[model samples]
Structures are given as C-alpha cells and as structure tokens.
Target: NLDRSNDKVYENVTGLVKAVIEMSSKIQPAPPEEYVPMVKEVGLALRTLLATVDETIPLLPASTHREIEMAQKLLNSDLGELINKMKLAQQYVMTSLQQEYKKQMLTAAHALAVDAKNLLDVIDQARLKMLGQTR
Candidate 1:
C-alpha cells in the first residue's frame, strides 16, 4: 500500500529540495528586496519539506525512522539559523556590514542545502530498502 506512496513522497521531497537549492543559490546576487523574498520562499519550501517528512514518518519502515528523525532535527535547526541570519542581513542591508551579512546569509543557505540533501538521501535509501523488501 505504501510502496507507491513512498515513491511519490520521494519525488515530492526531491522537488522541494531542488527548489531550496535553486533559491538559495540566487541569494548572493539578488538585490536586498529580492533577497528578502527569495529567502522567504526558501523558508516556506523548507517548512513544507519538513512537514512532509514528519507526516510520512510513520508510513516508512522502522529502520529508517531514527535516521530520518535525526535528519529532520538537523534540518529544523538549520532552518532556524538561516532565518535568523536573514533577519540580521536585512537589518544591516544598507550598512557597510552589508557584504559581511550577505556572506553569512549565503553560508547559512549553503548549510541548508547540505542539510536538505542529507535528508533527501535518507529518504532515497529508505525507499530503496522498501523496494528491496517487496522484491
């Protein structure tokens, strides 16, 4: 029953992670106003991805549960850090510290990308395990 559901969830997660990576990559070159909205969009995507994982946890195998939970926790903390960095960058957007803040924001975004990718990898592995079992 959940075999197809796992595939669908994996696809959804892949799409969301791709969106985050793409959006985060644009942060460095974007104008201040544009940066705000871009970060906001990334935040929304991350939240959606986390929520999806949380919703699907019980459906996944028990072996995957611990790894997924750890990944989710890491991603959650990274999301909070990214948002905090965004707020600081916005506050200093017009100052000489603007460049530094932008750099910090970019770093945070990169960390998020890494965390999201790690979560995606865990999901992919879980899906493969499920496939192996069914075979």
Candidate 2:
C-alpha cells in the first residue's frame, strides 16, 4: 500500500498515517473503538516533535533556516491532519462497534501509534540532520 503519494506526504510525517488512511478506507465503515487513543498518540508525537528543537540550532548557519521552516510547516500540517483524524476517531467511538471492528481497530491503532512515533522522531532528526547537528 506504500505507493508514490504515500511516500511523498509520508516522507515528512510518519509513513504510518498513510497506512492508517489506507486501512481505514478498506474497513467496513464502523467506528473502531480504539481509534481515539491511536489518534491522540499521533497528536502528542507531532506536538513533541514540534517542540523538540535545541535553541542553539537556531543560531547556526543561515542555510539552516530553510529546513527549520520546512519542519515547522510539516508539523503544522501534520497537526492539522491529526485533528481531522481525531474527528474520524470520534465518529468511530460515537458509533457502535462490532467485536471484529473493535479488534481490528485496536490492532491498527497500536501499530499506528508505534510507527507514527517512529516517523515523527525521524522527522525531528531530519531537521537536525539538515542543520548538521545530529549525532
């Protein structure tokens, strides 16, 4: 399911979101019970990545500014998308869930949470990498 479009947007944010989007699309349209917590974790990771910069990096070479701004824009966009996902999760939770739906959702949410965190961490590192500050 990792197509070109998934690679593009996911290149910046967590690639897992693309996976989540794909799986969500193929499901039976029930609100998956664990969807909310899954989305909440993504939101938290995005926020953490947004706030994870070292102050001294800001004083680096002028070339660093572009990457910093890129990170900012990405964080903003991802956060926005996270909000939308939250709405989807809300719909999932608010609606009744079948046992199978709940099971699949919980599994999907668990995987998404882990992979999204991995993506956001890489994104944070990418910013530092651009600044030549990563260890």
Candidate 3:
C-alpha cells in the first residue's frame, strides 16, 4: 500500500512534469492558437499539483522537507503567475499583443521548467541519502 500523501504528490507531480514537457514541445512547432488548448490542459494539471503541495510536506523525509517546500513555493508563486499569463495569452486579441504575452510566457515557462528540474534533483538526492543510510 502507498502512503497517501506521498502517492498524491508523486502522481500530481508526475502529471504536471509530463504536461510541462509536452507544453514545451507543442509551443515551438505550431501556431499559438494550436498550442493554447494544450497550455490550458497543462495549467489544470499544474493547478492540481500545487494544490496538494502542502499536504505532501508531512509525508516527506525531514531532511528534504525544505526542498519540497521550496518547490511548492516556486510552483505556487512565480510559476503560478506565469501560467496565468499563458492562459490569458490564449484569448483572441491583437496579434502584436498576443506575441508579447507569448514572449513573457516563454521566459516564465523556462524558469518554471528549471525549477521543476531542480525539484527532481532534490528528490533524487533525498532518495540516495536514504539508500546510503540503509547500507
């Protein structure tokens, strides 16, 4: 049986990360119109993940709790705002304005992607620490 909080966080984070990867891929080859729907889908997945961040805290190892919290803060803070802009950019409007929003969204998206990768790194380190302790 899985620990509820751990499983929830893992599932949500997995979904959010996969969606982010897909969003990154979709943005480059297609028109914004084509990518906008996919962006919304990713946003929804992210929303779910962020919502559960607090709940995941107690489930994590004490040594790595700070790492999880920092990731949660990034997702709920800077990344949250960036995703909002991406969603708004989807609205039909002047092409020039849309392009600007897309520009902003990409910068923010890149940062969020980096932060997400860092979170993965923290988890890996924490797991390794546990394995080393077991030996």
Candidate 4:
C-alpha cells in the first residue's frame, strides 16, 4: 500500500512536469508575466513529490531504485535548470532587458524542458517495467 502510494506520487509529479513542459513551449516572443508565479507553484509541487520519493527510495526494489534514482537525479537537474533560466528570463522581461539575453535564456529553458520530458518518460518506463517484472 505504501509502495502504491509512493508510485502514485511519482505519477502525479510527472504529470506536473508535463504541464511545465507545455507552459515552457507556450512562451512565444517572451514569457508570460504570470509564468513566475506558475513556476513557483510547479517547483513547490515537484519538491514535495521528490521528498516523498526520497523517503521511499530505500524501500523500492533494487532495480526500481536504481532506475528511479537516475531519472530522479536527471529530472531534478532539468527542473532546476529550467527554473533558473526562466527566472532570469522573467527578470529580463521586467527590466526590459536586452532581447538578446532574454532570447538566450529562453532557448536554454526550452532545451531543459525537453530534457525534463525525456527524463520523465524514462521514469515512467522504469515504473512500468518494475511493475511488470513484479507481476
């Protein structure tokens, strides 16, 4: 039951991550003024989910543990990268900073979003495989 709960949390976390990706792709010539608030919410949710997973990590089967750890690390990195770049982009937008700097930050954000998506996919696969093997 606890394992199931943990896995459910993981699923929810990935769903939120996908939302972040969607938001990231929606940024056109510039980020939405509201993106900063949204990022804070998403970041909080991610941190909470990660906390749950961290506790359950040692309890997972060895295979799941290893795969999930790798995915989690990569996902965390991607998330941080996206958040940092997005914050910078937001600052640039507010200050009416150089278009060049904003463009660079946003481009890097897009790349991190892609990485987040890929890492989430891998985590999903690991979850499925672990379940299958256990069954």
Best by lDDT: 1
How high is the CA lDDT of each candidate model?
A: 0.76, 0.49, 0.66, 0.60
**Model 3 residue 58 distance off true place after TM-score fit, in angstroms:** 4.5
Error of 4 at 47 (Å): 1.9
What are the models' TM-scores?
0.80, 0.42, 0.65, 0.60
Q: How many residue pairs clash in each candidate?
A: 0, 1, 0, 0
Tens digit of per-residue lDDT, candidate 3, span 24-98: 666655565776776676678777876666664555578898877777678656566676777767673456577
Off by over 4 Å in 1: 1-8, 133-135
Arranged by TM-score, best first? 1, 3, 4, 2
Winner on TM-score between 1 and 4 is 1
What digit string (tens of lDDT, one per residue) describes model 1 on residues 1-135? 344444545665566567667766787667678877777777777777887888778777899999999998987788778778888888887778876887887787778778788887888778678667555
For candidate 2, list the clashing residue pairs, or say none. Answer: 31-92
Which residue pairs clash within candidate 1? none
Candidate 4 lDDT at 96 equals 55
Candidate 2 positional error at 129, Å: 8.9
User: Any runs in candidate 2 off by more than 4 Å, and if so which?
Assistant: 1-33, 54-56, 92-135
